């Protein structure tokens, strides 16, 4: 149907906007602390601590399969990246501090993305 195509053009346009958001968030991580999944070879206990691991590459695979239906789902994944890090790593660590910085900086980008998604529909 024509409606299904209109829908698909919107999901596609959301995906376009979310890809730009993801590029902007990832630039707030120049160290690349969040680029890839935490290695279970290098942190073998990780899944005893963290039940839903997340990372930018995993978000990107989902993005490119148009697997984010709305901005809320995307934000949930971004928040896992931050929140997992702040629980696993102590407050005095480069990792915890990197998450705090990504969170604060991400906030601005996400605040404008929400207005763009409402605004354009």
PDB file of C-alpha atoms in Angstrom:
ATOM      1  CA  UNK A   1       0.000   0.000   0.000  1.00  0.00           C
ATOM      2  CA  UNK A   2       0.741   3.702  -0.333  1.00  0.00           C
ATOM      3  CA  UNK A   3       0.367   4.234   3.470  1.00  0.00           C
ATOM      4  CA  UNK A   4       3.094   1.552   4.146  1.00  0.00           C
ATOM      5  CA  UNK A   5       5.460   3.412   1.814  1.00  0.00           C
ATOM      6  CA  UNK A   6       4.693   6.851   3.522  1.00  0.00           C
ATOM      7  CA  UNK A   7       5.420   5.126   6.891  1.00  0.00           C
ATOM      8  CA  UNK A   8       8.640   3.620   5.491  1.00  0.00           C
ATOM      9  CA  UNK A   9       9.709   7.051   4.133  1.00  0.00           C
ATOM     10  CA  UNK A  10       9.215   8.440   7.754  1.00  0.00           C
ATOM     11  CA  UNK A  11      11.168   5.531   9.375  1.00  0.00           C
ATOM     12  CA  UNK A  12      13.845   6.254   6.752  1.00  0.00           C
ATOM     13  CA  UNK A  13      13.869   9.900   7.576  1.00  0.00           C
ATOM     14  CA  UNK A  14      14.026   9.103  11.317  1.00  0.00           C
ATOM     15  CA  UNK A  15      16.984   6.819  10.564  1.00  0.00           C
ATOM     16  CA  UNK A  16      18.642   9.684   8.680  1.00  0.00           C
ATOM     17  CA  UNK A  17      18.194  12.038  11.637  1.00  0.00           C
ATOM     18  CA  UNK A  18      19.263   9.356  14.176  1.00  0.00           C
ATOM     19  CA  UNK A  19      22.437   8.637  12.142  1.00  0.00           C
ATOM     20  CA  UNK A  20      23.441  12.275  12.404  1.00  0.00           C
ATOM     21  CA  UNK A  21      22.633  12.271  16.164  1.00  0.00           C
ATOM     22  CA  UNK A  22      24.753   9.123  16.550  1.00  0.00           C
ATOM     23  CA  UNK A  23      27.677  10.769  14.724  1.00  0.00           C
ATOM     24  CA  UNK A  24      27.459  13.812  16.943  1.00  0.00           C
ATOM     25  CA  UNK A  25      27.365  11.695  20.160  1.00  0.00           C
ATOM     26  CA  UNK A  26      30.230   9.595  19.111  1.00  0.00           C
ATOM     27  CA  UNK A  27      32.354  12.794  18.514  1.00  0.00           C
ATOM     28  CA  UNK A  28      31.960  13.536  22.238  1.00  0.00           C
ATOM     29  CA  UNK A  29      33.959  10.266  22.799  1.00  0.00           C
ATOM     30  CA  UNK A  30      37.336  11.003  21.053  1.00  0.00           C
ATOM     31  CA  UNK A  31      39.058   8.426  23.307  1.00  0.00           C
ATOM     32  CA  UNK A  32      36.734   5.757  21.806  1.00  0.00           C
ATOM     33  CA  UNK A  33      35.894   4.317  25.288  1.00  0.00           C
ATOM     34  CA  UNK A  34      32.325   3.518  24.034  1.00  0.00           C
ATOM     35  CA  UNK A  35      33.043   2.520  20.411  1.00  0.00           C
ATOM     36  CA  UNK A  36      32.909  -1.208  20.752  1.00  0.00           C
ATOM     37  CA  UNK A  37      31.381  -3.770  23.125  1.00  0.00           C
ATOM     38  CA  UNK A  38      33.211  -4.390  26.382  1.00  0.00           C
ATOM     39  CA  UNK A  39      35.422  -7.511  25.657  1.00  0.00           C
ATOM     40  CA  UNK A  40      34.300 -10.621  27.536  1.00  0.00           C
ATOM     41  CA  UNK A  41      37.822 -12.017  26.840  1.00  0.00           C
ATOM     42  CA  UNK A  42      39.338  -8.991  28.752  1.00  0.00           C
ATOM     43  CA  UNK A  43      36.509  -8.516  31.361  1.00  0.00           C
ATOM     44  CA  UNK A  44      35.316 -12.115  31.864  1.00  0.00           C
ATOM     45  CA  UNK A  45      33.003 -11.261  34.828  1.00  0.00           C
ATOM     46  CA  UNK A  46      31.336  -8.369  32.922  1.00  0.00           C
ATOM     47  CA  UNK A  47      27.955 -10.021  32.454  1.00  0.00           C
ATOM     48  CA  UNK A  48      27.710 -10.868  36.195  1.00  0.00           C
ATOM     49  CA  UNK A  49      27.665  -7.041  36.662  1.00  0.00           C
ATOM     50  CA  UNK A  50      26.003  -5.613  33.610  1.00  0.00           C
ATOM     51  CA  UNK A  51      22.845  -7.311  32.229  1.00  0.00           C
ATOM     52  CA  UNK A  52      22.338  -5.248  29.105  1.00  0.00           C
ATOM     53  CA  UNK A  53      25.687  -4.193  27.566  1.00  0.00           C
ATOM     54  CA  UNK A  54      25.642  -1.447  24.996  1.00  0.00           C
ATOM     55  CA  UNK A  55      28.156   0.400  22.762  1.00  0.00           C
ATOM     56  CA  UNK A  56      28.159   2.687  19.713  1.00  0.00           C
ATOM     57  CA  UNK A  57      28.832  -0.070  17.140  1.00  0.00           C
ATOM     58  CA  UNK A  58      25.942  -2.173  18.448  1.00  0.00           C
ATOM     59  CA  UNK A  59      23.692   0.976  18.241  1.00  0.00           C
ATOM     60  CA  UNK A  60      24.851   1.580  14.669  1.00  0.00           C
ATOM     61  CA  UNK A  61      24.022  -1.994  13.491  1.00  0.00           C
ATOM     62  CA  UNK A  62      20.525  -1.493  14.928  1.00  0.00           C
ATOM     63  CA  UNK A  63      20.222   1.961  13.346  1.00  0.00           C
ATOM     64  CA  UNK A  64      21.157   0.660   9.878  1.00  0.00           C
ATOM     65  CA  UNK A  65      18.583  -2.169  10.074  1.00  0.00           C
ATOM     66  CA  UNK A  66      16.051   0.657  10.818  1.00  0.00           C
ATOM     67  CA  UNK A  67      15.528  -0.971  14.225  1.00  0.00           C
ATOM     68  CA  UNK A  68      14.815   2.313  16.129  1.00  0.00           C
ATOM     69  CA  UNK A  69      11.031   3.071  15.825  1.00  0.00           C
ATOM     70  CA  UNK A  70      11.297   6.408  17.710  1.00  0.00           C
ATOM     71  CA  UNK A  71      13.854   8.654  19.519  1.00  0.00           C
ATOM     72  CA  UNK A  72      12.925   7.196  22.908  1.00  0.00           C
ATOM     73  CA  UNK A  73      14.279   3.730  21.916  1.00  0.00           C
ATOM     74  CA  UNK A  74      17.540   5.315  20.681  1.00  0.00           C
ATOM     75  CA  UNK A  75      17.958   7.369  23.880  1.00  0.00           C
ATOM     76  CA  UNK A  76      17.396   4.201  25.977  1.00  0.00           C
ATOM     77  CA  UNK A  77      20.413   2.589  24.271  1.00  0.00           C
ATOM     78  CA  UNK A  78      22.545   5.753  24.717  1.00  0.00           C
ATOM     79  CA  UNK A  79      21.625   5.816  28.381  1.00  0.00           C
ATOM     80  CA  UNK A  80      22.694   2.111  28.731  1.00  0.00           C
ATOM     81  CA  UNK A  81      26.119   3.023  27.454  1.00  0.00           C
ATOM     82  CA  UNK A  82      26.464   5.724  30.156  1.00  0.00           C
ATOM     83  CA  UNK A  83      24.703   3.977  32.986  1.00  0.00           C
ATOM     84  CA  UNK A  84      26.527   0.624  32.565  1.00  0.00           C
ATOM     85  CA  UNK A  85      29.839   2.466  32.699  1.00  0.00           C
ATOM     86  CA  UNK A  86      28.992   4.446  35.854  1.00  0.00           C
ATOM     87  CA  UNK A  87      28.000   1.245  37.700  1.00  0.00           C
ATOM     88  CA  UNK A  88      30.917  -0.994  36.615  1.00  0.00           C
ATOM     89  CA  UNK A  89      33.623   1.652  37.066  1.00  0.00           C
ATOM     90  CA  UNK A  90      34.387   3.610  40.219  1.00  0.00           C
ATOM     91  CA  UNK A  91      33.869   7.351  40.450  1.00  0.00           C
ATOM     92  CA  UNK A  92      37.647   8.054  40.430  1.00  0.00           C
ATOM     93  CA  UNK A  93      38.335   6.267  37.080  1.00  0.00           C
ATOM     94  CA  UNK A  94      38.958   7.615  33.603  1.00  0.00           C
ATOM     95  CA  UNK A  95      36.069   5.422  32.373  1.00  0.00           C
ATOM     96  CA  UNK A  96      33.458   6.769  34.821  1.00  0.00           C
ATOM     97  CA  UNK A  97      34.539  10.312  34.149  1.00  0.00           C
ATOM     98  CA  UNK A  98      34.340   9.743  30.394  1.00  0.00           C
ATOM     99  CA  UNK A  99      30.707   8.638  30.794  1.00  0.00           C
ATOM    100  CA  UNK A 100      29.847  11.711  32.869  1.00  0.00           C
ATOM    101  CA  UNK A 101      31.315  13.918  30.110  1.00  0.00           C
ATOM    102  CA  UNK A 102      29.474  12.040  27.271  1.00  0.00           C
ATOM    103  CA  UNK A 103      26.229  12.338  29.236  1.00  0.00           C
ATOM    104  CA  UNK A 104      26.538  16.099  29.827  1.00  0.00           C
ATOM    105  CA  UNK A 105      27.550  16.818  26.243  1.00  0.00           C
ATOM    106  CA  UNK A 106      25.108  14.393  24.698  1.00  0.00           C
ATOM    107  CA  UNK A 107      22.305  16.233  26.565  1.00  0.00           C
ATOM    108  CA  UNK A 108      22.507  19.260  24.258  1.00  0.00           C
ATOM    109  CA  UNK A 109      22.386  17.179  21.042  1.00  0.00           C
ATOM    110  CA  UNK A 110      19.482  15.082  22.335  1.00  0.00           C
ATOM    111  CA  UNK A 111      17.527  18.128  23.502  1.00  0.00           C
ATOM    112  CA  UNK A 112      17.587  19.536  19.921  1.00  0.00           C
ATOM    113  CA  UNK A 113      16.921  16.111  18.311  1.00  0.00           C
ATOM    114  CA  UNK A 114      13.686  15.804  20.349  1.00  0.00           C
ATOM    115  CA  UNK A 115      12.506  19.206  18.997  1.00  0.00           C
ATOM    116  CA  UNK A 116      13.439  18.141  15.393  1.00  0.00           C
ATOM    117  CA  UNK A 117      11.550  14.833  15.684  1.00  0.00           C
ATOM    118  CA  UNK A 118       8.423  16.613  17.091  1.00  0.00           C
ATOM    119  CA  UNK A 119       8.807  19.516  14.597  1.00  0.00           C
ATOM    120  CA  UNK A 120       9.222  17.408  11.383  1.00  0.00           C
ATOM    121  CA  UNK A 121       6.855  14.674  12.736  1.00  0.00           C
TER     122      UNK A 121
END
